[PDB]
Design an enzyme around this catalytic site. Structure first.
Site, short mmCIF file in Angstrom:
data_model
loop_
_atom_site.label_atom_id
_atom_site.label_comp_id
_atom_site.label_asym_id
_atom_site.label_seq_id
_atom_site.Cartn_x
_atom_site.Cartn_y
_atom_site.Cartn_z
N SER A 238 8.59 -5.45 -2.20
CA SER A 238 7.58 -4.85 -1.33
C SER A 238 6.46 -4.15 -2.08
O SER A 238 5.49 -3.73 -1.44
CB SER A 238 8.22 -3.83 -0.40
OG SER A 238 9.20 -4.41 0.43
N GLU B 110 10.15 -14.62 2.08
CA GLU B 110 10.52 -15.55 1.01
C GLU B 110 10.25 -14.98 -0.39
O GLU B 110 10.94 -15.34 -1.34
CB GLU B 110 9.78 -16.88 1.20
CG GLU B 110 10.20 -17.67 2.43
CD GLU B 110 9.66 -17.09 3.75
OE1 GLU B 110 8.57 -16.47 3.75
OE2 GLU B 110 10.32 -17.29 4.79
O1 LIG Z 1 16.53 -0.32 0.89
C1 LIG Z 1 15.70 -0.97 1.32
C2 LIG Z 1 14.38 -0.61 1.38
C3 LIG Z 1 13.42 -1.46 1.78
C4 LIG Z 1 11.98 -1.04 1.87
P1 LIG Z 1 11.17 -1.30 0.22
O2 LIG Z 1 12.00 -0.60 -0.78
O3 LIG Z 1 11.15 -2.78 -0.01
O4 LIG Z 1 9.92 -0.89 0.27
C5 LIG Z 1 13.89 -2.62 2.37
C6 LIG Z 1 13.01 -3.47 3.03
C7 LIG Z 1 13.53 -4.60 3.68
C8 LIG Z 1 14.85 -4.88 3.63
C9 LIG Z 1 15.72 -4.04 2.98
C10 LIG Z 1 15.20 -2.91 2.35
O5 LIG Z 1 16.05 -2.13 1.75
O6 LIG Z 1 15.09 -6.09 4.32
C11 LIG Z 1 13.88 -6.49 4.87
O7 LIG Z 1 12.90 -5.63 4.37
#
Ligand SMILES: O=c1cc(CP(=O)(O)O)c2cc3c(cc2o1)OCO3
Length: 270
Positions: free
Chosen positions: A47, A145
């Site tokens: 992300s 993806e």
């Molecule tokens: O612990 C996390 C944290 C994030 C947010 P970030 O750290 O990427 O910003 C997270 C985002 C997700 C996910 C699981 C995730 O698990 O599954 C779909 O999107």
């Protein structure tokens, strides 16, 4: 190379306990001193690209007045897992600025994909990064993806050094105009997803803005931040991890520990 050698051994011990690879680049914007550990290796962005995405939107808003206030309407099929803000406005739409804030501060996946569309897709974001002098960054795919984090795959990766260099240019340098730069900083400062990462290493009296990334596989997660200690110039740093096996879990505590070592290496008492 002095500061990098100061913390080489504790970094190796930390990643061996973690069971994977840790990549760190930290720059003291005052002295110019830097700390590097695996800083030129590629790691999956996960992300963390969403911060640069919002910066790319802010850059476009300098030429397209009214871009930020433009309402974006979307259907249920635009919702992707982890869209905590955009799911609440499905029936109303959101502005480009609201989508950008949600992408930065909640890591909202539907918001990220909608903004990617506005910019011409992954190649459009990559083009913006090239325009600020980043030749390392590449975004290739969309959410979700891009989270595959396959070992050896260069898609959707950058290096800790390039992430830090681009973050510096956008938050402290001249890559954005002054109003847009402060807006980017403000979005990073208001992030809600990083309390256990770089922020866990930063004293309460220091300002910090950050953007997290979590791929969910291959022990792959990250955080980058600008930190404003009191009484000295800001620090920019990036902490990325990955691990060899698909089922290896990431560790927020490892990210925080790596940030602590980077600040300790820079001589930042915290
Ligand atoms: O612990 C996390 C944290 C994030 C947010 P970030 O750290 O990427 O910003 C997270 C985002 C997700 C996910 C699981 C995730 O698990 O599954 C779909 O999107």
């Amino acid at each position: 190379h002095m500061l990098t050698n100061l913390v080489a051994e504790p970094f190796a011990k930390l990643e061996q306990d973690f069971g994977g690879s840790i990549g760190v680049y930290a720059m003291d914007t005052g002295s110019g001193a830097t700390v590097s550990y695996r800083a030129e290796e590629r790691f999956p962005l996960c992300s963390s690209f969403k911060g640069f995405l919002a910066a790319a939107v802010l850059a476009r808003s300098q030429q397209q007045a009214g871009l930020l206030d433009t309402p974006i309407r979307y259907g249920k099929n635009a919702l992707v897992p982890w869209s905590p803000i955009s799911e609440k406005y499905l029936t109303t739409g959101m502005t480009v600025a609201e989508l950008s804030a949600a992408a930065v501060q909640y890591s909202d996946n539907a918001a990220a994909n909608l903004l990617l569309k506005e910019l011409g897709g992954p190649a459009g974001l990559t083009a913006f990064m090239r325009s600020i002098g980043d030749t390392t960054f590449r975004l290739d795919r969309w959410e979700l993806e891009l989270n595959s984090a396959i070992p050896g795959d260069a898609r959707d990766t950058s290096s800790p050094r390039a992430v830090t260099e681009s973050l510096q240019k956008l938050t402290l340098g001249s890559a954005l105009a002054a109003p847009q730069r402060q807006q980017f900083v403000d979005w990073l400062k208001g992030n809600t997803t990083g309390n256990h990462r770089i922020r866990a290493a930063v004293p309460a009296d220091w300002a910090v803005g950050d953007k997290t990334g979590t791929c969910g596989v291959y022990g792959t997660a990250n955080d980058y931040a600008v930190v404003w200690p009191t009484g000295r110039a800001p620090i920019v740093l990036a902490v990325y991890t990955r691990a060899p096996n698909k089922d290896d879990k990431h560790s927020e505590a490892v990210i925080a520990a790596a940030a602590r070592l980077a600040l300790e290496g820079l001589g930042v008492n915290g």
